[PDB]
Design a protein around this nucleic acid. Structure first.
Lengths: 129, 86, 80, 25, 98, 136, 149
RNA sequence: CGCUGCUGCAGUUGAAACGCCCGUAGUUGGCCCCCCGCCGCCACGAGGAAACGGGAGCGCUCCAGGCAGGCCCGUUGGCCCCGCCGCGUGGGACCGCGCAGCGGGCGCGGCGCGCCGCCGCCGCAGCCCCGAGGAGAGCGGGCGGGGGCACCGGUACCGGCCGGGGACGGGUGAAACAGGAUGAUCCCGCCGAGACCGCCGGCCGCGCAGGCGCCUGCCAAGACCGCCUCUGUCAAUCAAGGGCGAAGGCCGGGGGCUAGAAGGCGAUCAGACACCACCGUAUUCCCGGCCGUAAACGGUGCCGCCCCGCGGCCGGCGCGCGCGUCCCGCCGGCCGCCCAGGGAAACCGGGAGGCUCCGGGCUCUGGGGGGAGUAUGGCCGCAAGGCUGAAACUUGAAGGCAUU
């Protein structure tokens, strides 16, 4: 069954980049996928993402500029202590300066670099580099 | 109470083959069968071949340990087809 | 050709399955049809599998099929 | 078929062994 | 290694096929793996056909053909040259050649 | 693999059951080896040599490797131990105390000595190496 | 994927984006609710009540024309099926295969389909019992199923 | 040593996907309401022995050390760390989870309040997410060697005849033992019995797998498809537990044609007791039970997602056109070839791809070769045996796929 909506969306995003296409359509729209796309858009990995209203579960059309290498989801959402937001950085992404792990925190769903400054720790949603 | 349900009467006697065979036949002999005439499960055996309904009150000829028998069920069916033909 | 998504071709969308589409939508419509005995128009489903009787001729005007309902008596066309 | 022939040989030893245990009960 | 995708048999969407026997060997062979060359020949050899055709007192009767499906087991087929052992390159060819 | 936040018990159980599959873990932690080892967890043990015997070399080497049949005192288990060095079997005499230590393969056999799991180290309370070098 | 078969098929129904009543349609909520109530008098199942409204009348979607689904209309009138129709329809099938099984004791294939159908009746009943759309006392047995139908 | 794998192993062929299907615990669950209540979660608190470890200062001659020392912060001997599922406060994303109508007034209900009532008392928009390329249910329309059950037809093989006619016939690699003036073989005319369903018959189809093919009639089902039908997550995989499961085998009956384990036999060959010829018992076949195994295979678990063209077939459905079993699509199944991608290659690409850039969910199994699927205990079976399942001990390779 479709347990992880994010994984299906992000694998489609990365498969479309690997062939190299300008628009991809994601079959299930989730407010968490919409937030994940937003963090990537702000950082500039992706462009405009459009949520078509199915009136059922909805769809998303994400415009791909071609700068994303690997975007993934860490499942189960694991619990990351603040004195471990750095341990995840080396195991998951390439170089401390390049790449972003998104972790949900009481403050919100934010990239690790922001959380490290706030001295907060959350639950990891996924890795986009 | 376990494998030898009705053959416990025999006790540790007569050997397994006889007791296993008796368990099939004796269960069938002591069973209640449906009257062809009254369609009620009250036919029981009085003697080998003689089966009487305790509701219909009708005596029918039958198998020694069953109201109907496999050779006889075949015969009625062949007779009906052949009778329909002639 | 620059044809893209979010704004796709209507003809191309029809060929695609109703649910495998940007908006899952009905493939069936209602039909305005006129019977031989009665000139009033009865609105019917295009894929009615139910036995449907004309408000005039007693016999059913609907013949049920695997896809679109076929009709037995006089036929009008295109509901408006 | 040396594997099928090994199994048969194993079986004709296990039945002999099962008989020997039965003599002593 | 796996020599052939087909596995030597044409079984698709099935778990069992009807057994047939080699005409020569008599080995039971599942219908899918049998060589199965149909032959339509003539009741008598061409060398005798001319003389039989002249002999008949009937107005227009041709030597009547004999139809038989020969089904052979793999070993019977390679020994009797019905099929040949081919190279890994030509093994894929499926069109009847020659 | 099992991937649930609440699947720690299953993962612990799998490791416990699967861990014994590796042969070295089973030798080390089952405890069958500790009972079986003629030297029970000891680095070495003392014994009396009943017979001085030579074990033919396994192929392809050809030699009469010299060995002693020794009855270890701690378990009263007779064993075969190689007497190392050239012509050093001469120092060993039957009915003589000896100390027997492993061949460095942890109970396995080394090279072409078939079924020899240990080497004599000291005969009559004097190290074999010292006798061959004529130190004592 | 089908619950009891290794079969994949998609033959669904695509409800329109518009949730608002169609222009040609002239039936007031009371007009169709009356049809639903008279169709319950005929005893027609809600799956058929919805189909009859769709084809003889032009109300393809009841909830679009009215504000509630067929069973919500029935429950408000207290005229809903005592046993939800889905379970009842499975129970008819279980008794029908069971009847055939009474004549033929060698249809092992038929017996297999019974285990699958019976398993659904148990699964849907546990959901229906938990939701309380079914009395908690309700038990589907099998021998007593003929009476339950 | 990533050879134990949470990070982070492997299971097509190296070791390893249970023969299949249902299924309870267990584990896992589409999307969805900004605001709180309880969670888990996370942040920082207190409060908790030193030694030790880390660490501040200090020349024990250096040093391992030790807390010393120098006319000195109140000269020092600071500070960090007990994993703490305890507690305190904050946050509230994520994560689950909340069935009950509210609200006004009375009213200071025994120092203030809530209860707890009582009055429609006229203030609430009072009280429904939606409708999953989730799932079940429905209707329709075709689909198939899917299942049962009865009925049946066709030769062929074998046997028993009537006639005919005349010397050999079988058998083989060549033979030989059988058969034949008791007239065989051969031919025809018949007849009995029991199996079996040819050619059509397949990159056909159906079934949960094992499997499925005479003719008629009957019965119940099943997948696929079409849909503006119903319900509203009813789901995914699964120990335990249930059912099924080729052949051979076993049991109690029936049946007995054909082949034919055993048995016997003729030829072989040094010897074959084997292959080949001949005769033949169990078996084959039916009904009622057992058994529970197969190279039960795609050597490839199941559900879900995107993924590149070019084909064929198959079952529905729709589009075009005058219009033909045409054409283009759509959905579902069976497949071929394959660009990337992957892999030790073979190869796979409807995956074995999207994976060292390693984490969608669930179960199963493996961990060098043997010993050994043995011993023993258990459970199961009438038995044969199945299922579970070691150790002592031995050993430097065993194995995969490629290349000369």
């Amino acid at each position: 069954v479709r347990i992880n909506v994010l994984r299906d969306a992000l694998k489609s995003i990365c498969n479309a980049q690997r062939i190299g296409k300008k628009q991809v359509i994601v079959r299930p729209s989730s407010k968490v996928i919409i937030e994940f796309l937003q963090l990537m858009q702000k950082n500039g990995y992706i462009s405009d993402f459009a949520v078509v209203d199915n009136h059922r579960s909805n769809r998303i059309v994400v415009n791909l500029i071609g700068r994303l290498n690997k975007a993934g989801v860490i499942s189960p959402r694991f619990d990351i202590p603040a004195n471990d937001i750095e341990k995840w950085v080396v195991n998951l992404l390439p170089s401390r300066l390049f790449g972003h792990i998104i972790l949900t925190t009481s403050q919100g769903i934010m990239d690790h670099i922001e959380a490290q400054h706030r001295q907060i720790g959350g639950k990891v949603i996924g890795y986009f580099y | 109470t376990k494998k030898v349900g009705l053959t416990g009467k025999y006790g540790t006697r007569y050997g397994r083959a006889a007791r296993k065979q008796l368990l099939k036949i004796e269960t069938s002999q002591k069973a209640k069968y449906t009257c062809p005439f009254c369609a009620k499960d009250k036919v029981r055996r009085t003697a080998c071949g003689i089966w009487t309904c305790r509701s219909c009150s009708k005596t029918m000829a039958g198998g020694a340990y069953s109201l109907h028998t496999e050779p006889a069920n075949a015969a009625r069916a062949t007779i009906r087809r052949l009778r329909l033909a002639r | 050709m620059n044809v893209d998504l979010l704004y796709p071709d209507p003809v191309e969308e029809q060929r695609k399955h109703k649910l495998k589409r940007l908006v899952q939508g009905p493939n069936s419509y209602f039909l305005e049809i006129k019977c031989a005995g009665c000139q009033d128009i009865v609105v019917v489903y295009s894929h009615a599998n139910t036995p449907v009787f004309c408000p005039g001729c007693t016999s059913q005007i609907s013949i049920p099929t695997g896809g679109k309902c076929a009709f037995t008596s006089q036929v009008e066309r295109y509901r408006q | 078929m040396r594997a099928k022939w090994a199994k048969k040989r194993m079986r004709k030893l296990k039945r002999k062994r099962r008989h020997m245990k039965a003599r002593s009960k | 290694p796996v020599k052939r995708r087909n596995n030597g048999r044409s079984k698709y969407n099935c778990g069992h096929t009807n057994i047939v026997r080699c005409q020569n060997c008599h080995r039971c062979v599942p219908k899918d793996k049998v060589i199965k060359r149909f032959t339509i020949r003539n009741i008598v050899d061409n060398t005798i056909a001319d003389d039989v055709l002249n002999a008949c007192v009937i107005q227009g009767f041709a030597i009547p053909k004999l139809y038989n499906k020969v089904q052979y087991c793999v070993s019977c087929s390679i020994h009797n040259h019905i099929v040949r052992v081919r190279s890994r390159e030509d093994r894929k060819i499926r069109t009847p050649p020659k | 693999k099992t991937s649930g936040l609440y699947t720690a018990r299953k993962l612990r159980t799998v490791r416990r059951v699967n861990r014994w599959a590796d042969k070295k873990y089973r030798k080390a932690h089952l405890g069958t080896w500790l009972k079986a080892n003629p030297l029970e967890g000891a680095c070495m043990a003392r014994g009396i040599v009943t017979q001085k015997i030579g074990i033919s070399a396994k192929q392809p080497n050809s030699a009469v490797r010299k060995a002693v049949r020794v009855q270890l005192t701690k378990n009263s288990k007779k064993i075969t131990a190689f007497v190392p060095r050239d012509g050093s079997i001469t120092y060993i005499d039957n009915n003589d105390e000896v100390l027997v230590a492993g061949f460095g393969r942890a109970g396995r056999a080394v090279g072409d000595i078939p079924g020899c799991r240990f080497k004599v180290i000291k005969v009559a309370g004097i190290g074999l190496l010292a006798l061959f070098l004529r130190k004592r | 994927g089908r619950m009891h078969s290794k079969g994949k098929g998609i033959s669904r129904s695509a409800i329109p984006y518009t949730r608002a009543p169609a222009p040609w349609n002239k039936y007031t909520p009371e007009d169709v609710c009356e049809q639903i109530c008279k169709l319950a008098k005929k005893g027609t199942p809600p799956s058929r009540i919805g189909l009859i409204l769709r084809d003889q009348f032009a109300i393809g979607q009841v909830k679009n024309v009215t504000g509630s689904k067929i069973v919500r209309i029935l429950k408000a009138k207290g005229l809903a099926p005592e046993i939800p129709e889905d379970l009842y329809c499975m129970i008819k099938k279980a008794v029908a295969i069971r009847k055939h099984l009474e004549r033929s004791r060698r249809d092992k294939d038929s017996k297999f389909r019974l285990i699958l159908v019976e398993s659904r009746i148990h699964r849907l009943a546990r959901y229906y019992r938990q939701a309380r759309r079914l009395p908690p006392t309700f038990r589907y047995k099998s021998d007593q199923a003929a009476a339950l139908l």
